[PDB]
């Protein structure tokens, strides 16, 4: 029942292959559903539910909004060049903003900006003031809090518009969002110098949260385990592994344990 809508903007002075001058990706509960860049200059879908939105010339309009705003990203890129006394070259401007619905129905909002891969300025919409990270950021704090309008305008969107679209988005993608897909689990064995390296792999689970652990005759082995980060598949599902180094006679005491929302009780797997 909690949900998220976030937009990620990347803007750079010098394009490069696969890096346009400006790109924007919208995510629903972490899965892409809307894309735009300054080469195609067109808002395009990234999820199937977006295809039955019911707004008619919504795509034409939001495309135009984006086309118009990449002017302002180019300006802010030069402002930031001169404010930080850099040369002309490669610089990078980044933005993440959006809203959350928590399980009690309350709302959160965020608007964060990043220059050169470092924090720059963040909205604290509770106080309608910006937290600056910098001498250079302190200016934009003072210019934004002088004019008076942006903080509350962005607080408005975050608390109203954003949330209004979130709920509509959740009900179009109800079926994708609530589907569940079990993991296929396989345990692999490889010993070299009298050390058996057991590798447990969980493929294709949705949703993303997972527990994977290792059991030695039924007792967790939390320090002898290293696990990878949950990483994405191409079809919206996820992937994780967990290895353990153990000794080849201690082989039939070893179980991988996979707790996932898709299974009522944890699965157990051996090699």
């Amino acid at each position: 029942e909690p949900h998220s809508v976030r937009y990620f903007h990347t803007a750079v002075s010098e394009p490069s292959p696969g890096v346009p001058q400006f790109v924007s990706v919208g995510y629903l509960d972490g899965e892409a559903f809307v894309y735009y860049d300054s080469e195609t200059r067109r808002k395009e879908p990234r999820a199937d539910w977006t295809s039955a939105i019911d707004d008619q010339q919504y795509w034409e309009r939001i495309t135009r909004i984006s086309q118009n705003n990449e002017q302002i990203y180019r300006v802010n890129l030069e402002t930031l060049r001169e404010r930080y006394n850099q040369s002309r070259g490669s610089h990078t401007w980044q933005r993440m903003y959006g809203c959350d619905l928590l399980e009690d129905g309350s709302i959160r909002g965020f608007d964060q900006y990043g220059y050169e891969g470092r924090d720059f300025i963040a909205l604290d919409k509770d106080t309608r003031t910006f937290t600056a990270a910098d001498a250079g950021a302190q200016i934009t704090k003072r210019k934004w809090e002088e004019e008076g309008t942006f903080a509350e305008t962005m607080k408005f969107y975050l608390e109203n518009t954003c949330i209004e679209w979130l709920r509509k988005y959740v009900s179009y993608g109800k079926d994708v969002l609530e589907r569940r897909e079990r993991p296929e689990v396989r345990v692999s064995g490889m010993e070299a110098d009298k050390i058996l390296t057991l590798s447990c792999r969980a493929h294709g689970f949705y949703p993303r949260p997972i527990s994977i652990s290792w059991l030695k005759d039924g007792v967790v082995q939390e320090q002898e385990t290293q696990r990878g980060s949950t990483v994405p598949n191409s079809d919206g599902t996820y992937h994780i592994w967990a290895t353990i180094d153990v000794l080849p006679g201690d082989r039939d005491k070893y179980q991988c344990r996979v707790e996932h929302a898709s299974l009522p009780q944890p699965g157990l797997f051996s090699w």
């Binding site: 937009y7 984006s66 402002t79 404010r83 903003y97 962005m154 969107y157 518009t161 679209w165």
Partner: peptide, 9 residues
């Protein structure tokens, strides 16, 4: 939908 008002730095 994206927020229309973008600010300048």
């Amino acid at each position: 939908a994206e927020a229309i008002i973008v600010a300048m730095v």
